[PDB]
Amino acid sequence: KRVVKGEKSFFLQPGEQLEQGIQDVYVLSEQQGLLLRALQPLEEGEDEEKVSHQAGDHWLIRGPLEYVPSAKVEVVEERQAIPLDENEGIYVQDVKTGKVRAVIGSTYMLTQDEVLWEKELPPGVEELLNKGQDPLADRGE
Amino acid sequence: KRVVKGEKSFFLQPGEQLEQGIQDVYVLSEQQGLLLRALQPLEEGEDEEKVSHQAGDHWLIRGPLEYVPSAKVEVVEERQAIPLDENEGIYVQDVKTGKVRAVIGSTYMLTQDEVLWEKELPPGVEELLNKGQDPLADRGE
Protein backbone atom coordinates (compact mmCIF):
# COMPACT_ATOMS: atom_id res chain seq x y z
CA LYS A 1 0.00 0.00 0.00
CA ARG A 2 0.92 3.66 -0.15
CA VAL A 3 -0.57 6.58 1.74
CA VAL A 4 -1.04 9.82 -0.21
CA LYS A 5 -2.01 12.99 1.64
CA GLY A 6 -2.25 16.68 0.91
CA GLU A 7 -3.41 19.13 -1.69
CA LYS A 8 -2.55 16.86 -4.57
CA SER A 9 -4.17 15.51 -7.71
CA PHE A 10 -3.01 12.52 -9.75
CA PHE A 11 -4.18 9.64 -11.93
CA LEU A 12 -4.71 6.10 -10.74
CA GLN A 13 -2.31 4.31 -13.09
CA PRO A 14 -3.40 0.83 -14.30
CA GLY A 15 -3.15 -1.78 -11.60
CA GLU A 16 -3.58 0.71 -8.79
CA GLN A 17 -6.77 1.14 -6.78
CA LEU A 18 -7.95 3.33 -3.95
CA GLU A 19 -8.53 1.30 -0.79
CA GLN A 20 -11.56 3.07 0.68
CA GLY A 21 -12.01 6.15 -1.50
CA ILE A 22 -10.95 9.68 -0.77
CA GLN A 23 -10.61 9.86 3.01
CA ASP A 24 -10.37 12.89 5.26
CA VAL A 25 -7.67 13.54 7.80
CA TYR A 26 -8.14 13.40 11.58
CA VAL A 27 -8.03 16.89 13.07
CA LEU A 28 -8.22 16.81 16.85
CA SER A 29 -8.81 19.41 19.53
CA GLU A 30 -6.96 19.27 22.83
CA GLN A 31 -10.06 17.60 24.28
CA GLN A 32 -9.83 14.72 21.78
CA GLY A 33 -7.53 11.75 21.46
CA LEU A 34 -6.95 8.65 19.37
CA LEU A 35 -6.09 5.16 20.56
CA LEU A 36 -4.21 3.29 17.88
CA ARG A 37 -2.34 0.00 17.57
CA ALA A 38 0.82 -0.97 15.72
CA LEU A 39 0.63 -3.80 13.22
CA GLN A 40 4.37 -3.94 12.49
CA PRO A 41 7.46 -2.48 14.19
CA LEU A 42 7.61 1.15 13.16
CA GLU A 43 9.44 4.42 13.72
CA GLU A 44 7.56 7.73 13.67
CA GLY A 45 9.64 10.81 14.42
CA GLU A 46 7.03 13.57 14.09
CA ASP A 47 8.92 15.78 16.56
CA GLU A 48 12.66 15.71 17.40
CA GLU A 49 12.31 12.48 19.38
CA LYS A 50 11.56 9.04 17.98
CA VAL A 51 8.93 6.65 19.34
CA SER A 52 9.62 3.02 18.45
CA HIS A 53 6.76 0.58 18.71
CA GLN A 54 6.50 -3.19 18.65
CA ALA A 55 4.18 -5.36 16.62
CA GLY A 56 1.29 -5.40 19.08
CA ASP A 57 1.60 -2.11 20.92
CA HIS A 58 -0.87 0.63 21.71
CA TRP A 59 -0.33 4.31 22.32
CA LEU A 60 -2.47 7.40 22.66
CA ILE A 61 -2.58 10.46 20.45
CA ARG A 62 -3.88 13.60 22.13
CA GLY A 63 -3.73 17.32 21.52
CA PRO A 64 -4.62 19.86 18.85
CA LEU A 65 -3.11 18.34 15.72
CA GLU A 66 -3.91 16.76 12.39
CA TYR A 67 -3.14 13.05 12.09
CA VAL A 68 -3.17 10.92 8.94
CA PRO A 69 -2.98 7.17 9.62
CA SER A 70 0.15 5.37 8.51
CA ALA A 71 0.06 2.07 6.67
CA LYS A 72 1.54 0.21 9.66
CA VAL A 73 -0.82 1.78 12.23
CA GLU A 74 -4.46 0.92 12.89
CA VAL A 75 -6.87 3.36 14.55
CA VAL A 76 -8.65 1.59 17.42
CA GLU A 77 -10.76 4.16 19.25
CA GLU A 78 -11.58 7.85 19.38
CA ARG A 79 -11.29 9.30 22.88
CA GLN A 80 -12.54 12.48 24.50
CA ALA A 81 -11.52 13.84 27.85
CA ILE A 82 -13.90 13.67 30.80
CA PRO A 83 -14.73 17.05 32.42
CA LEU A 84 -14.43 16.93 36.19
CA ASP A 85 -15.07 19.57 38.81
CA GLU A 86 -12.95 19.78 41.92
CA ASN A 87 -14.36 17.13 44.31
CA GLU A 88 -15.73 15.09 41.42
CA GLY A 89 -14.01 12.01 40.12
CA ILE A 90 -14.11 8.66 38.35
CA TYR A 91 -12.71 5.18 38.98
CA VAL A 92 -10.20 3.98 36.43
CA GLN A 93 -8.44 0.63 36.20
CA ASP A 94 -4.93 0.16 34.86
CA VAL A 95 -5.50 -3.20 33.16
CA LYS A 96 -1.78 -3.86 32.70
CA THR A 97 -1.48 -4.34 36.47
CA GLY A 98 -5.06 -4.27 37.73
CA LYS A 99 -4.80 -1.32 40.11
CA VAL A 100 -8.14 0.43 40.21
CA ARG A 101 -7.85 3.93 41.68
CA ALA A 102 -9.87 7.15 41.87
CA VAL A 103 -8.78 10.16 39.82
CA ILE A 104 -10.37 13.28 41.28
CA GLY A 105 -10.08 16.95 40.37
CA SER A 106 -9.12 18.27 36.95
CA THR A 107 -10.54 17.04 33.66
CA TYR A 108 -9.02 13.78 32.61
CA MET A 109 -8.38 11.65 29.54
CA LEU A 110 -7.87 7.95 30.24
CA THR A 111 -4.51 7.04 28.75
CA GLN A 112 -3.50 3.75 27.20
CA ASP A 113 -4.14 0.69 29.40
CA GLU A 114 -6.90 2.44 31.37
CA VAL A 115 -10.59 1.58 31.48
CA LEU A 116 -13.47 2.69 33.67
CA TRP A 117 -14.05 0.59 36.78
CA GLU A 118 -17.56 0.30 38.17
CA LYS A 119 -17.89 0.50 41.95
CA GLU A 120 -20.65 -1.69 43.35
CA LEU A 121 -22.51 -1.06 46.58
CA PRO A 122 -24.25 -3.24 49.19
CA PRO A 123 -28.06 -3.46 49.09
CA GLY A 124 -29.73 -0.42 50.57
CA VAL A 125 -26.69 1.86 50.67
CA GLU A 126 -27.67 3.28 47.27
CA GLU A 127 -31.15 4.12 48.57
CA LEU A 128 -29.55 5.94 51.50
CA LEU A 129 -27.04 7.98 49.51
CA ASN A 130 -29.66 9.93 47.57
CA LYS A 131 -32.20 10.36 50.40
CA GLY A 132 -29.54 11.94 52.62
CA GLN A 133 -29.52 15.22 50.65
CA ASP A 134 -32.48 16.45 52.73
CA PRO A 135 -33.79 13.53 54.85
CA LEU A 136 -35.71 15.87 57.16
CA ALA A 137 -39.21 14.46 57.53
CA ASP A 138 -37.85 10.92 57.36
CA ARG A 139 -35.62 11.80 60.30
CA GLY A 140 -38.74 13.18 61.96
CA GLU A 141 -40.76 9.99 61.64
CA LYS B 1 -10.06 27.18 -2.68
CA ARG B 2 -9.72 30.94 -2.75
CA VAL B 3 -11.60 33.55 -0.74
CA VAL B 4 -12.62 36.72 -2.58
CA LYS B 5 -14.02 39.65 -0.61
CA GLY B 6 -14.85 43.27 -1.23
CA GLU B 7 -16.45 45.58 -3.73
CA LYS B 8 -15.32 43.54 -6.70
CA SER B 9 -16.80 42.03 -9.84
CA PHE B 10 -15.25 39.32 -11.99
CA PHE B 11 -16.02 36.35 -14.22
CA LEU B 12 -15.95 32.73 -13.13
CA GLN B 13 -13.37 31.40 -15.58
CA PRO B 14 -13.94 27.83 -16.87
CA GLY B 15 -13.22 25.22 -14.25
CA GLU B 16 -13.94 27.54 -11.36
CA GLN B 17 -17.11 27.42 -9.27
CA LEU B 18 -18.54 29.32 -6.34
CA GLU B 19 -18.71 27.15 -3.24
CA GLN B 20 -21.93 28.38 -1.64
CA GLY B 21 -22.92 31.41 -3.72
CA ILE B 22 -22.40 35.05 -2.92
CA GLN B 23 -21.98 35.18 0.86
CA ASP B 24 -22.16 38.15 3.19
CA VAL B 25 -19.52 39.15 5.69
CA TYR B 26 -19.86 38.85 9.47
CA VAL B 27 -20.26 42.27 11.06
CA LEU B 28 -20.33 42.07 14.84
CA SER B 29 -21.24 44.48 17.60
CA GLU B 30 -19.31 44.55 20.85
CA GLN B 31 -22.07 42.37 22.33
CA GLN B 32 -21.46 39.63 19.75
CA GLY B 33 -18.74 37.06 19.28
CA LEU B 34 -17.73 34.14 17.09
CA LEU B 35 -16.31 30.81 18.16
CA LEU B 36 -14.24 29.33 15.38
CA ARG B 37 -11.88 26.37 14.93
CA ALA B 38 -8.67 25.96 12.98
CA LEU B 39 -8.48 23.20 10.40
CA GLN B 40 -4.78 23.66 9.59
CA PRO B 41 -1.91 25.54 11.25
CA LEU B 42 -2.37 29.17 10.33
CA GLU B 43 -1.05 32.68 10.94
CA GLU B 44 -3.42 35.65 11.03
CA GLY B 45 -1.83 39.00 11.82
CA GLU B 46 -4.84 41.32 11.63
CA ASP B 47 -3.25 43.74 14.12
CA GLU B 48 0.47 44.23 14.87
CA GLU B 49 0.69 40.95 16.77
CA LYS B 50 0.44 37.46 15.29
CA VAL B 51 -1.74 34.66 16.63
CA SER B 52 -0.53 31.20 15.62
CA HIS B 53 -2.96 28.34 15.87
CA GLN B 54 -2.63 24.58 15.71
CA ALA B 55 -4.64 22.13 13.68
CA GLY B 56 -7.42 21.57 16.20
CA ASP B 57 -7.57 24.82 18.13
CA HIS B 58 -10.41 27.13 19.06
CA TRP B 59 -10.44 30.82 19.76
CA LEU B 60 -13.03 33.53 20.24
CA ILE B 61 -13.67 36.60 18.12
CA ARG B 62 -15.40 39.44 19.92
CA GLY B 63 -15.84 43.16 19.41
CA PRO B 64 -17.19 45.60 16.84
CA LEU B 65 -15.55 44.41 13.64
CA GLU B 66 -16.19 42.80 10.28
CA TYR B 67 -14.86 39.27 9.85
CA VAL B 68 -14.64 37.25 6.64
CA PRO B 69 -13.86 33.55 7.21
CA SER B 70 -10.52 32.29 5.98
CA ALA B 71 -10.14 29.06 4.05
CA LYS B 72 -8.31 27.39 6.94
CA VAL B 73 -10.81 28.51 9.61
CA GLU B 74 -14.26 27.07 10.34
CA VAL B 75 -16.97 29.06 12.12
CA VAL B 76 -18.37 26.96 14.97
CA GLU B 77 -20.80 29.12 16.93
CA GLU B 78 -22.18 32.63 17.18
CA ARG B 79 -22.03 34.03 20.72
CA GLN B 80 -23.71 36.93 22.46
CA ALA B 81 -22.82 38.35 25.82
CA ILE B 82 -25.06 37.73 28.82
CA PRO B 83 -26.37 40.90 30.55
CA LEU B 84 -25.94 40.73 34.32
CA ASP B 85 -26.92 43.17 37.02
CA GLU B 86 -24.77 43.63 40.09
CA ASN B 87 -25.68 40.73 42.43
CA GLU B 88 -26.80 38.58 39.52
CA GLY B 89 -24.66 35.84 38.08
CA ILE B 90 -24.29 32.57 36.22
CA TYR B 91 -22.34 29.33 36.72
CA VAL B 92 -19.74 28.60 34.07
CA GLN B 93 -17.49 25.57 33.71
CA ASP B 94 -13.99 25.69 32.28
CA VAL B 95 -14.08 22.33 30.49
CA LYS B 96 -10.32 22.27 29.93
CA THR B 97 -9.84 21.75 33.67
CA GLY B 98 -13.35 21.22 35.01
CA LYS B 99 -13.49 24.12 37.47
CA VAL B 100 -17.06 25.32 37.70
CA ARG B 101 -17.28 28.79 39.27
CA ALA B 102 -19.77 31.65 39.59
CA VAL B 103 -19.21 34.84 37.61
CA ILE B 104 -21.23 37.64 39.20
CA GLY B 105 -21.54 41.32 38.39
CA SER B 106 -20.89 42.86 34.99
CA THR B 107 -22.19 41.51 31.70
CA TYR B 108 -20.21 38.55 30.52
CA MET B 109 -19.33 36.63 27.38
CA LEU B 110 -18.24 33.04 27.95
CA THR B 111 -14.82 32.71 26.36
CA GLN B 112 -13.35 29.66 24.70
CA ASP B 113 -13.45 26.47 26.82
CA GLU B 114 -16.39 27.73 28.90
CA VAL B 115 -19.89 26.29 29.07
CA LEU B 116 -22.85 26.89 31.36
CA TRP B 117 -23.01 24.64 34.42
CA GLU B 118 -26.39 23.78 35.88
CA LYS B 119 -26.65 23.83 39.67
CA GLU B 120 -28.99 21.19 41.07
CA LEU B 121 -30.83 21.44 44.36
CA PRO B 122 -32.14 18.95 46.95
CA PRO B 123 -35.88 18.14 46.92
CA GLY B 124 -37.96 20.85 48.54
CA VAL B 125 -35.31 23.58 48.63
CA GLU B 126 -36.59 24.90 45.29
CA GLU B 127 -40.12 25.16 46.70
CA LEU B 128 -38.74 27.13 49.65
CA LEU B 129 -36.63 29.59 47.66
CA ASN B 130 -39.58 31.16 45.84
CA LYS B 131 -42.08 31.11 48.73
CA GLY B 132 -39.64 33.03 50.93
CA GLN B 133 -40.18 36.32 49.07
CA ASP B 134 -43.24 37.01 51.25
CA PRO B 135 -44.02 33.88 53.31
CA LEU B 136 -46.22 35.83 55.73
CA ALA B 137 -49.44 33.88 56.14
CA ASP B 138 -47.56 30.61 55.84
CA ARG B 139 -45.41 31.75 58.75
CA GLY B 140 -48.66 32.58 60.52
CA GLU B 141 -50.16 29.12 60.15
Task: Show which residues on chain B lie within 8 Å of chain A, measured between beta carbons.
Answer: 37-40, 54-58, 93, 95-100, 122-125
Which of A105, A64, A130 lies closest to B58 in space, CA to CA? A64
- What does the angle CA B19 – CA B25 – CA B30 come to, to the nearest 5 degrees? 145
DSSP codes joined into one string, A36-105: EEESS-EEE-SSSS-EEE-TT-EEEEESSEEE---SSEEEEEEEE-B---TT-EEEEEETTT--EEEEES
Q: How many Å apart are CA A10 and CA B27, to the nearest integer?
A: 40
* Chain centre distance of CA B85: 20
Helix H or strand E segment including B48: none
Which positions in chain A touch B124 (Cβ < 8 Å)? 134, 136
- Measured between beta carbons, the chain B residues lying within 8 angstroms of A63 are 54, 56
